[PDB]
Structure formats: structure tokens, C-alpha cells
Design a protein around this ligand. Structure first.
Ligand code: NA
Length: 431
């Protein structure tokens, strides 16, 4: 009777028997190309006027335009069978009359498969998942529904919902019913707040949200109305239009999640004094092996140049600081600028045999001894010091560290990343 849907990583999707652990994010490294598949079962003897799929992704996943492929019963559709619209944050794929004829009026269940990919990018934050979000909007009447578009709150934590209503022709009409929405953290898929719009007030502001987190208002199905989520035009505002299409509720599968990991370090001496200007690379073995580098063909000339120029300025700041008596915030700022340039340039990682390779990632301690690495797979890695802090001997041994699902954030480690934090969330490196 009703169609069935699932979305998962390529090869895992199963509309009949969806995977049990979907909610648990799968560890990837920055630059990974994540392959997705949507599988939809359409019943025999269907007579749909609309069969539309739409997907929107959180900002750390860059939809790869041109990667969409669609098959029915493992047979490729023709260009004329669907209308595909691609945007920075995803796509909409709508069957034309020609495409509908291939899933309608069939004597057996039809299986639609849509595959595509997205690239995990440098906007991803360690331990915060990234996600897509597919909705299948269908019915015997034309349907105007689509998938939610995630959005961040305004600077002060406010996110506002506005709802309007139209008939099947697009003409405004009064609210047809009370409308309930679940405000969902779009990264993790957890509901944070439920709101209800009465028939006389079509807007509501939710306060206290995280300005660096994406959310979405997911409409609970209202009988005979389809939810058309408007493109995002500004932070802190989400608009929804309800069409009186008189179609069934849409299909809304449980999407998988991806996540990257990281590690924090503090450079100190034997008295726990924090040291600026120590430089390190990362190796994949306790001796020999390879070193962590950004992939040269995935980084622009401008991105590479910024790493170099900010490093030069950091070198100058470290020099000027080291000249000061015990009795510079300049170092911290310069180091943060360099760190930001490194993150922006680290679009993808690879392992290289030559530690002198110009693309090898180089970490530098600030005036609080701090340095860090983000965007990694879990594993056992090894720091190698390449430049000692002024006045100290070069370390001779590599230092083992473990990257895990909580290694960036957890206490129970060597030292406070930032003194006084109360969290021992960094690896201690002693000079
Ligand atoms: Na969905």
C-alpha cells in the first residue's frame, strides 16, 4: 500500500530492514568523500502525480554537484525522466511525467535507487556530527512538499519560525489546523524543543540556542497538508509554507551521521611552565613511517600562501616574545591566525614519507603552550618535535597519543589545555 524508504551510506540502505545503529556517527577524516544512497520501494499499481526527493546537508558536508545517479529496478533513467536542481547544500529530484510512467501502473513493486556523494570539509568541528536529511514527497495529487533546510540561530541564540498556508493552486488561505514542529539539532538529530502554532499566531521565536549549531523545525504531518521549507536567506529565520495538496504524509528515513576527531596538546617544562614556539609534525609510527600532510592537489594557491605568510608572522611574534623579560598576547593571536589558516588549508589528508615535504602539517605552541590537530580518524599517532622552544634541548623520542571519539573534549588526560579550565583535556609534552 504505502511506499518505503531508507537512506544510508552506499551499500547499506535497506527500506525493508533499516540498519540498527544509524544514529551513531561514523568516523571520517576531513576530505573524505562520503557516498550516499536513497532506496525507495514503490508499490505495484501506483498512480502518483508526484514523486519528489529532496536532500539538504549541514555545512560541514559539501554536496558534490554532478554525482547524482538514479535507477529504477537497477535500470538507469533518462535525462527527460526527472528534473534535477542542485544547490550548495543539496538537491531536489522530481520525476517528470515520463519518469512517473516508469514507476506507475506496474504489476510489481518498483525499487528506486538514488546515489550521490558529499565531501567532508574544513568547516566540520571535531566531535560534532554532520548529516544530510532526505524527504520523499509523493501522492496522487501534485505535491509541493520538500525537505527541511538547516539554519544557525542569530548571534544571540534566537531562531524564529514563520508559517504560511496556501491551497493547491498556491493561493494564501487561513491556517487549516494547529501546527506542531519539533526543533531538532540538525548535526546530531536530537529534538531540543517542541513548539505549536495556534491558528491565530503563525510565528514563534526560540531563544537560548547555540550560535555555532545548525537546527531545523520539522513539521509534524498535518492531514492533507504538505510542508514546503523555504530556502534559507538569513541566520535565525526559517520559513515554512503549508500546501493543501491532500496527499499522504511524506516519507522521512533516519539518516546516518559522520564525525571527525582531534587532539589537544600543551608544551611545558619540568616545572609545568608553558612554552611558546615549539614545532611538531605527526607520524603514523613510533619510528620511521610517514608524516601527516595536506593533500597538495586539494589545496588552492591562496590557501597554501596564507599558511606560509601567517607562519612567518608567527615566527616574528615568537621572536619578539622570547626577547621579553618574565615581567605576549601577540604570540597567542599570531598562533591562532596560523592555526586557522592551517585548518582552512587542511582540506584533505595523506601520509608522506618525506618529513620535509612542504605540505606536512606543522603545529606550533602558543604562549600558553597550546597546539592542536583536528579532522582525524581514530588511532594511535606520534608527535615528533622538529623545533625546540628557545633554551631547551630538542626531544629525541616521539610522543604517542591516542585519537578517539572523545579525545578532544574529555578530561582525564595530562593537563588543562587552558590553565584554570578545570578540565584536563590535553596531552602534556615535557621539554
Ligand atoms: Na529526513
Amino acid at each position: 500500500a504505502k511506499p518505503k524508504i531508507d537512506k544510508d551510506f552506499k551499500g547499506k540502505a535497506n527500506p525493508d530492514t533499516p540498519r540498527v545503529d544509524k544514529d551513531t556517527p561514523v568516523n571520517h577524516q576531513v576530505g573524505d568523500v562520503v557516498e550516499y544512497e536513497i532506496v525507495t520501494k514503490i508499490p505495484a499499481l501506483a498512480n502518483y502525480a508526484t514523486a519528489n526527493w529532496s536532500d539538504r546537508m549541514t555545512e560541514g558536508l559539501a554536496f558534490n554537484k554532478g554525482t547524482v545517479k538514479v535507477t529504477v529496478d537497477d535500470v538507469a533513467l533518462e535525462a527527460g525522466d526527472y528534473a534535477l536542481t542542485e544547490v550548495a547544500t543539496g538537491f531536489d529530484l522530481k520525476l517528470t511525467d515520463a519518469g512517473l510512467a516508469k514507476v506507475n501502473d506496474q504489476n510489481a513493486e518498483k525499487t528506486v535507487k538514488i546515489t550521490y556523494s558529499a565531501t567532508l570539509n574544513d568547516k566540520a568541528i571535531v566531535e560534532v556530527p554532520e548529516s544530510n536529511d532526505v524527504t520523499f514527497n509523493y501522492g496522487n495529487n501534485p505535491d509541493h512538499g520538500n525537505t527541511p533546510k538547516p539554519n544557525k540561530p542569530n548571534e544571540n541564540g534566537d531562531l524564529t519560525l514563520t508559517k504560511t498556508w496556501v491551497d493547491a493552486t498556491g493561493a494564501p488561505i487561513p491556517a487549516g489546523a494547529e501546527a506542531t514542529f519539533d526543533l531538532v539539532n540538525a548535526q546530531a538529530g536530537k529534538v531540543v524543543q517542541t513548539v505549536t502554532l495556534t491558528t491565530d499566531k503563525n510565528t514563534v521565536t526560540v531563544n537560548g540556542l547555540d550560535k555555532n549549531t545548525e537546527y531545523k523545525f520539522v513539521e509534524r504531518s498535518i492531514k492533507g497538508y504538505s510542508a514546503d521549507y523555504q530556502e534559507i536567506t538569513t541566520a535565525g529565520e526559517i520559513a515554512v509554507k503549508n500546501w493543501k495538496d491532500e496527499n499522504p504524509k511524506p516519507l522521512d528515513p533516519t539518516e546516518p551521521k559522520v564525525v571527525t576527531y582531534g587532539k589537544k596538546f600543551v608544551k611545558v617544562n619540568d616545572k609545568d611552565n608553558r612554552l611558546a614556539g615549539a614545532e611538531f609534525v605527526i607520524a603514523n609510527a613510533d619510528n620511521a613511517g610517514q608524516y601527516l600532510a595536506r593533500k597538495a592537489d586539494k589545496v588552492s594557491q591562496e590557501e597554501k600562501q596564507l599558511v606560509v605568510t601567517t607562519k612567518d608572522a608567527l615566527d616574528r611574534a615568537v621572536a619578539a616574545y622570547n626577547a621579553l623579560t618574565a615581567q605576549k598576547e601577540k604570540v597567542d593571536k599570531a598562533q591562532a591566525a596560523y592555526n586557522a589558516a592551517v585548518i582552512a588549508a587542511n582540506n584533505a589528508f595523506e601520509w608522506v614519507a618525506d618529513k620535509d615535504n612542504e605540505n606536512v602539517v606543522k603545529l606550533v605552541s602558543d604562549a600558553q603552550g597550546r597546539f592542536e590537530i583536528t579532522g582525524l580518524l581514530a588511532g594511535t599517532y606520534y608527535l615528533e618535535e622538529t623545533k625546540q622552544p628557545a633554551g631547551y634541548a630538542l626531544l629525541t623520542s616521539r610522543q604517542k597519543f591516542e585519537v578517539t571519539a572523545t579525545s578532544y573534549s574529555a578530561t582525564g588526560q595530562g593537563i588543562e589545555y587552558t590553565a584554570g579550565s578545570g578540565k584536563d583535556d590535553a596531552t602534556k609534552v615535557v621539554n
